Amino acid sequence: MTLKELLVGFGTQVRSIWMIGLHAFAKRETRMYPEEPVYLPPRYRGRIVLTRDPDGEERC
């Protein structure tokens, strides 16, 4: 490789190292399951149930 290519490559390596270190200075984006409960939107498709009418009888 050329000298200019080597110097530019070293500069890009330095930039990558610097950006990942600044990432180490950043805020964690981890959702701490299970101590922090998973937020689920109201129409989330998980466990199936059978429900009751307002009178208390089963709707099925």
Bin 3: left if φ > 0, else alpha if -120 < ψ < 50, else beta: alpha
Taking CB under 6 A as the rule, does residue 24 contact ligand 3PE? no
- Tell me which of 4, 49, 57, 60 binds another protein, using CB under 8 A: 49
Q: Which residues pair with 58 in a beta bridge?
A: 52
Asked whether position 7 contacts another protein by CB under 8 A, the answer is: no
In one-letter notation, the amino acid at residue 50 is L
60 binds another protein, rule: CB under 8 A? no
Residue 4 binds: one of ligand 3PE, another protein, none (C-beta under 5 to 8 A by kind): none
Helices (H), the chain: 3-24
Q: Binding to another protein by residue 57, rule CB under 8 A?
A: no
